[PDB]
Amino acid sequence: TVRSEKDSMGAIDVPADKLWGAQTQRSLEHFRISTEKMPTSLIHALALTKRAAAKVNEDLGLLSEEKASAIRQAADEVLAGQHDDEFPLAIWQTGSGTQSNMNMNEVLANRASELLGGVRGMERKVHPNDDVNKSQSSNDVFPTAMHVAALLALRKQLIPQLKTLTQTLNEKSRAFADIVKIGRTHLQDATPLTLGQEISGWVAMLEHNLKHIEYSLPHVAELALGGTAVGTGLNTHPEYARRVADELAVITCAPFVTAPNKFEALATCDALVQAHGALKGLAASLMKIANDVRWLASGPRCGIGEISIPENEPGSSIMPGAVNPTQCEALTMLCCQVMGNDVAINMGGASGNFELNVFRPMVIHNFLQSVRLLADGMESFNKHCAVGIEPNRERINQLLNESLMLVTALNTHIGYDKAAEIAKKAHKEGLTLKAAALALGYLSEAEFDSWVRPEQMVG
């Protein structure tokens, strides 16, 4: 049921059916804080880092081919989802991520030993420190895994979903390009614009956010691996840092490079503080877009009601006709989450000392959460709401034509004085602009229909 595993402090019992070792077991017993664990993206990035390190150590003649191949095979098993229950450690561990580094070293060593015909435990044929951690330090491995996970998540999840949502809204903007509606400034009725123009604002916001996110990628692509314990690379081959970045770039198909200054790479989380700045920008943009959608869809009768959205879940049986904007609610909630995550990241990033920033598990927990929230939130909002946005054309026209705002089209025909008189009379007596104008005898009905053309008021 248990086996005895050892580290420099002594022996400790580990579950027989688990692949980790003594240091993982100590962390599991001493850091029992809350429920947040390393996310799968980060575990995979740690496995990729070890896979690349083993390949380079073999190329340099520092690690035998049979050991290096077995380590890479064990790492591929982690990436293939075969070992999710072998990583039991909390986010709230040592601030360098040493314990999760050792978790990977121990699981990979014990599994690689089995792949070479050996066993797990202290009789193993592959060793967590001398083999799996060769040429490495927790201090440079963990920030490498942080940047690998972050860059891949941005490239493979967030950016595709952002592009997909932008395309949907761009199609809606073109489809609704001719639909004139009332403007709203300060929440008050205002000069008209088209529904397509209003949506084009959302599109332009999402296009700008994509650029800002792309600008953050080169710094995240810089990897600490090869700085070792304090940034000097003491005890490493001079080609190791470049070689391992190159190998990570090959196996991930992403443009990883070695960090030109390893002291900055170890002492800070600056690349992620900056990249998260772009994500909180996206959260502010998505909050505004989601709010416009739910306010424009508010109703069915006592709100704005200019657009309809898909109804995907049963409504309340006592609220007839109501369609709750549930995707908008999930999206606005996660946008608040991203804003809070930014503060946590900023505090951790500001708090490095000397050669090492030791707020790393918390920083990456927040960063990767924000990426999941924004990527999955954009996917959900796109599929279940944005693709189905439709205008309520009769309601749009009713609001526009019963407003006071079309009165400006009369200025050039009867003068601003009488046009203002028409608007004040309509407002005071609760009439339409046309009715007030006819009551005053300032024009005929034919003149009003010829002069007041909303389609000529949106240029």
Which residues within the stretch 208-267 sit at the binding site for a second copy (CB under 8 A)? 208-209, 211-212, 215-216, 219, 228-235, 260-261, 263-264, 266-267
- The reply on whether position 1 binds a second copy by CB under 8 A is no
Task: From the candidates 316, 317, 370, 384, give the one annotated as an active-site residue.
Answer: 316
Site string for a second copy, 415-454 (x = CB under 8 A): -----x--xx--x--x------------------------
* Sole binder of a second copy in the list 59, 201, 249, 254 (CB under 8 A): 201
Among the options 8, 100, 173, 186, which is catalytic? Answer: 186
30 is annotated as an active-site residue: no
Does residue 73 belong to the site contacting a second copy (CB under 8 A)? no
Residue with tokens 């604002």: 201
Q: Is 54 in the site for a second copy (CB under 8 A)?
A: no
Which DSSP state fits 353? B
Q: 356-372 burial, b for 16+ CB within 10 Å, e for fewer?
A: bbbbbbbbbbbbbbbbb
Any contact of residue 88 with a second copy (CB under 8 A)?
Answer: no
DSSP string, 8-60: TTEEEEEETT----HHHHHHHHH---SS-B--HHHHHHHHHHHHHHHHHHHHT
CA distances from 429 to 168, 397, 443, 448 (A): 44, 21, 19, 19
- Closest approach of Cβ 14 to a second copy, in Å? 14
**Which parts of 20-49 interact with a second copy (CB under 8 A)?**
22-23, 26-27, 30-36, 39
Q: Is 66 in the site for a second copy (CB under 8 A)?
A: no
What is the footprint of a second copy within residues 311-330 (CB under 8 A)? Answer: 311-327, 329-330
Residue 46 or 224 having the CB closest to a second copy: 224
48 contacts 248 by C-beta, under 8 angstroms: yes
- Residues 265-294 close enough to bind a second copy by CB under 8 A: 266-268, 270-271, 273-274, 276-278, 280-281, 283-285, 287-288, 291-292, 294
432 phi/psi in degrees, rounded to 5: -75, 160
The piece of 57-65, 106-114, 198-206, 246-254 that touches a second copy (CB under 8 A) is: 198-206
Which of 69, 73, 129, 170 lies at the binding interface for a second copy (CB under 8 A)?
Answer: 129
Q: Which of residues 337-356 bind a second copy (CB under 8 A)?
A: 337, 339-356
Q: Strands 257-258 and 222-223, how do they pair?
A: parallel
Q: What residue has token string 């059916």?
A: 17
Sign, CA dihedral 375-376-381-386, equals positive
Instruction: Count the Cβ atoms, other than its own, within 10 Å of residue 290.
Output: 25
Strand-pairing partners, residue 55, are none
Q: Does 138 bind a second copy (CB under 8 A)?
A: yes
Among 314, 332, 335, residue whose Cα is nearest residue 323: 314
Closest CB to a second copy among residues 115, 433: 433
- Peptide bond connecting 260 to the previous residue in cis, omega within 30 degrees of 0: no
Q: Catalytic: 44?
A: no
Catalytic residues, by residue number, are 186, 316
